Design a binder for this molecule. Structure first.
Ligand SMILES: [Cl-]
Ligand SMILES: [Mg+2]
Ligand SMILES: [Mg+2]
Ligand SMILES: [Zn+2]
Lengths: 979, 6
């Protein structure tokens, strides 16, 4: 027995048919560390280590430690080994997560050598971090005082400190934290594992050290391997770390305790930060929340609840979701759904955008609706739709760019971490069949009504939360923090303050001084020869069906067909452009002459894997004419391809644009969505503003997704009551302008047998379309004026952007630009914008189709300081000495981004986009060879190209009113002020 | 909850 000779006892072993894997549970004899080793033919290998880390306060220790362990370890004594992996590895996944009760460290890769490189850095980080040796990392990642000069105010700074101020300022994050903590006041979930900014400064390095000593011990660890690598070698890898420890009792300390269910419901009123120039009376929220049980529920109940959650909320047609939204009492759902990832399952439901006087009504509606579902039950067509949809997704197992092995780990860990069976959550074929059988034999009412009745309606463990906008909350919090720090300063002697100002300057210089290439040599990399000279092969065949371009990709898809039908919106009247996204929504959430929208949705849910309709807009390298499309993206079993294309035609051609009230609710939902895009994702808004000033593709998207769209939405509610017939006929001319056989493109991904069978369905679908669209043939120009702009929101944190067109310098695209851009992001901007500056993140974005090079920051306390960092990028590049090993790493890191692992639908889709944007296979290959040969000269050449962004680039910021005038007083009339 | 590094 190889295992036992390496110190591991094999506990349990099963074949899981669901994931075609042999899964083995080992236990390290000496420490008791448990290892789930899952072998299969999946080349996207996955590793993770998870520690059970319940906090006992809101100081944020687990979260701070999660950041700190990745800042240097025994074998990797450099500032930030995590970023070195980000820079120079072929990973498919690289991250770290702090959950309320556990901290996870996962990596993935298709390349076995790369995989084991990543695994070693992670193992050494969590077990032998440098952050427990002295306080420096703790201070940087956690909290420290900063004083620029004894004459000035002291401030609090730190990665996690700043991150949590960001978080605690987003209304929806506030609500979910209030709910979790109010539901579970007597265990670890009653406190914040990420850290409350009011409490983070109470944390001492000593507490932080002890937390690591106790909890980051193999005895308290669970380890996951998944994939096609050698099973025995996994244990050999682990023995290096596991053998270096003795058994520890800490798992007895880390065990999570159940919250005993309340005997009476709880009612709470809480504040979130709001803007003053906004009608506060209208932006309340109401959420009702439950803890569903104390006992771990039987495995059939767990499945049945997940099914129930989908049945009530899975689609726009699902009754709870549908009834709440059509009430008109709110703008959108909030903190809604089942969550079962923690010890006890929790269900919540609520609305945001509720008027003050309607809050009791939302509560009454929620309760009435839930009672109605228990009493009347669910129609069998709804139940069949959920069952097909669910069975389809489990079979497809489409995790996107998230590894399948990681998704499995997280399912296993959700029970394993509470000392329950780690195999059980991986299984679903048998439980699902049994549920299906109960529904046929007893009916949905007998299956689902008792769950609603006893776990929800008759459950006194209920928390109701009303959230109210507070225009002063944020100012008052800044006031308390300032007064706290003024007393800190007042309590210090002149020399205490000189010492702190010196520690400040010392820290700033340390984090602005990169580790030299000599140091970074401890982190290994692949050879440039370990890298395929060719791109990932995707079988494309260009063909022709009913006078229409068709792309076929012959790939194993597990008997699923993926189709995209691409219509052109290049010549849509400009007045129609901003209505395109609501047009797409109307196709999917209105009925036909013959069917209601519920009946159509249920047909789609019963027969297919879903259909979506969305705009796509991009520049095309070499032309002024943009690629501007609406895409209808559908999937089904190959045997239901016929039903898929029938339903797509039904959506496209038969839906009637007559539902005024549903259209009004789309508007409100969209307004809600845009408003919190601005708040928590303003960098996407700035990027859109800037592109809109620079090219037609950019201007078009911003009409449909930026500031211009939000502005358009406000004009729209008057237009919907006063002139519905105008809106409806606009919707109808968009359809007329787009639905045509001529210049349509059809993308198909499925195995070769399915494709043949599918073409008959495609041919028939194409037959039913008009030949030519209505409207013009010309793509008419649009642009926003080039202006520096600042967009005002209520926030603590900003989002700062700068961009310009680097092709305008006469710089010509070379693949080295991809390498350099990635390097800029992970070195200069990482070090200055995030670490030194205090932003959650900073990065650059190169659109090689338009030539626009953009700088962006995310949740940034600064504004003009950030723009200054952006301007210094050319000198950084010019100042660089990059040895061959540095070049090699930057190259590998870019090739990893380019060779990123894709499931077959993503392959065929990426191939579609290359065709649309004119990227031929010989262009791909030429660009890859340019990537593989990037040199020091390239870095210097590129410096001169991006200096045009410094000299002639435009800045757009989404920021505080305070910071906008503060900056407009330092640089007079720099930013034009948009409210 | 889930708080990430990158
Ligand atoms: Cl606990
Ligand atoms: Mg862009
Ligand atoms: Mg070259
Ligand atoms: Zn974090």
């Amino acid at each position: 027995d190889e295992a036992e000779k390496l110190g591991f006892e094999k506990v349990s072993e099963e074949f899981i048919s669901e994931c075609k894997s042999k899964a083995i549970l080992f236990k390290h004899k000496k420490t008791g560390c448990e290892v789930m080793s899952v072998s299969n033919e999946d080349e996207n290998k996955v590793f993770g280590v998870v520690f059970r880390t319940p906090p006992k306060d809101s100081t944020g220790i687990p979260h701070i430690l999660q950041h700190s362990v990745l800042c240097g370890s025994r074998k990797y004594p450099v500032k930030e080994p995590f970023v070195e992996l980000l820079k120079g590895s072929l990973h498919t996944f690289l991250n770290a997560f702090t959950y309320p009760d556990r901290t996870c460290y996962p990596v993935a890769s298709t390349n076995t050598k790369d995989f084991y490189n990543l695994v070693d850095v992670y193992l050494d980080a969590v077990f032998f971090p440098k952050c427990v040796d002295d306080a420096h990392t703790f201070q940087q990642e956690g909290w420290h005082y900063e004083l620029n000069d004894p004459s000035e105010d002291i401030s609090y700074k730190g990665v996690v400190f700043n991150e949590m101020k960001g978080v605690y300022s987003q209304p929806d994050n506030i609500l979910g934290r209030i709910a979790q903590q109010a539901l579970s006041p007597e265990n670890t979930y009653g406190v914040d594992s990420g850290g409350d900014p009011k409490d983070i400064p109470n944390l001492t390095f000593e507490e932080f050290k002890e937390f690591h000593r106790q909890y980051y011990h193999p005895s308290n660890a669970r380890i996951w391997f998944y994939g096609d690598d050698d099973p025995v070698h996994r244990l050999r890898v682990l023995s290096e770390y596991l053998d270096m420890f003795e058994a520890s009792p800490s798992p007895n300390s880390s065990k999570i305790k159940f919250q005993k269910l309340f005997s009476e419901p709880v009612r709470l009123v809480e504040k979130y930060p709001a803007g003053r120039d906004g009608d506060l009376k209208k932006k309340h929220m109401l959420c009702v929340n439950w803890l569903l049980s104390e006992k771990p529920l039987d495995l059939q109940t767990q499945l049945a609840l997940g099914f129930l959650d989908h049945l009530m909320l899975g689609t726009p047609a699902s009754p709870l979701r549908k009834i709440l939204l059509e009430s008109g009492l709110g703008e959108a759902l909030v903190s809604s759904g089942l969550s079962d990832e923690l010890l006890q399952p929790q269900f919540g439901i609520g609305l945001k955008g509720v008027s003050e006087e309607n809050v009791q009504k939302v509560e009454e509606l929620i309760m009435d609706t839930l009672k109605k579902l228990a009493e009347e039950g669910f129609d069998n067509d709804a139940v069949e739709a959920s069952m097909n949809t669910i069975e389809f997704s489990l079979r497809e197992n489409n995790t996107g760019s998230f590894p399948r092995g990681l998704s499995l780990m997280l399912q296993s860990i959700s029970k394993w971490i509470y000392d329950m069976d780690p195999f059980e959550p991986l299984k679903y074929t048998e439980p699902l069949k049994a549920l299906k059988t109960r529904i046929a034999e007893e009916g949905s009412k007998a299956v689902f009504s008792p769950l609603i009745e006893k776990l929800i309606l008759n459950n006194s463990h209920r928390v109701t939360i009303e959230m109210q906008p507070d225009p002063e909350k944020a100012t008052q919090e800044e006031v308390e923090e300032k007064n706290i720090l003024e007393k800190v300063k007042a309590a210090m002697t002149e020399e205490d303050l000189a010492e702190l100002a010196r520690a400040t300057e010392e820290l700033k210089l340390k984090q602005e001084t990169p580790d030299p290439p000599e140091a970074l040599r401890c982190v290994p990399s692949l050879n440039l020869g370990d890298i395929p000279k060719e791109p990932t092969y995707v079988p494309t065949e260009v063909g022709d069906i009913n006078g229409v371009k068709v792309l076929r990709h012959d790939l194993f898809t597990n008997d699923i067909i993926y189709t995209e039908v691409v219509f052109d919106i290049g010549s849509l009247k400009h007045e129609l452009l901003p209505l395109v996204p609501l047009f797409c929504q109307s196709l999917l959430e209105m009925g036909t002459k013959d069917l209601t929208f519920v009946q159509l949705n249920q047909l789609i849910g019963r027969k297919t894997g879903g259909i979506s309709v969305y705009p796509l807009t991009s520049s095309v390298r070499g032309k002024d004419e943009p690629c501007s499309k609406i895409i209808v993206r559908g999937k089904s079993m190959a045997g239901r391809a016929d039903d898929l294309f029938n339903l797509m035609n039904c959506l496209l051609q038969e839906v009637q644009f007559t539902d005024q009230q549903r259209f009004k609710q789309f508007v409100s939902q969209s307004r809600a969505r845009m408003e919190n895009r601005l708040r928590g994702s303003g960098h996407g808004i700035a990027a859109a503003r800037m592109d809109a000033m620079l090219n037609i593709a950019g201007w078009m998207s911003e009409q449909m997704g930026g500031l211009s769209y939000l502005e358009f939405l406000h004009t729209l509610e008057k237009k919907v009551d006063e002139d519905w017939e105008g809106i409806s006929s606009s919707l109808e001319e968009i359809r007329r302008s787009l639905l045509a056989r001529n210049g349509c493109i059809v993308n198909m991904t499925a195995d070769g047998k399915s494709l043949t069978n599918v073409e008959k369905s495609v041919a028939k679908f194409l037959d039913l379309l008009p030949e030519n669209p209505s409207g013009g043939l010309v793509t008419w120009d649009g642009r926003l004026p080039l202006r520096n702009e600042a967009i005002v929101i209520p926030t603590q944190v900003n989002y700062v952007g700068k961009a310009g067109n680097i092709y305008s310098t006469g710089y010509e695209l070379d693949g080295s630009a991809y390498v350099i851009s990635k390097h800029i992001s992970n070195t200069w901007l990482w070090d200055r914008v995030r670490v030194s500056g205090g932003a959650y993140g900073g990065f650059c974005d190169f659109d090689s189709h338009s030539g626009v090079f953009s700088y962006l920051s995310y949740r940034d306390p600064n504004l003009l300081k950030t723009l200054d960092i952006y301007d210094g990028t050319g000198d950084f590049l010019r100042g660089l000495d990059v040895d061959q090993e540095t070049l090699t790493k930057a190259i590998i890191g870019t090739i990893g981004d380019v060779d990123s692992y894709q499931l077959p639908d993503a392959k065929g889709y990426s191939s579609l986009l290359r065709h649309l944007l004119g990227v031929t296979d010989e262009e791909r290959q030429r660009k890859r060879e340019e990537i593989l040969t990037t040199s020091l000269k390239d870095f210097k050449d590129f410096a001169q190209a991006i200096d045009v962004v410094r000299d002639k680039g435009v800045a757009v910021a989404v920021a505080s009113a305070e910071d906008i005038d503060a900056a407009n007083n330092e640089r007079s009339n720099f930013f034009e002020v948009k409210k | 909850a889930a708080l990430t590094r990158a």
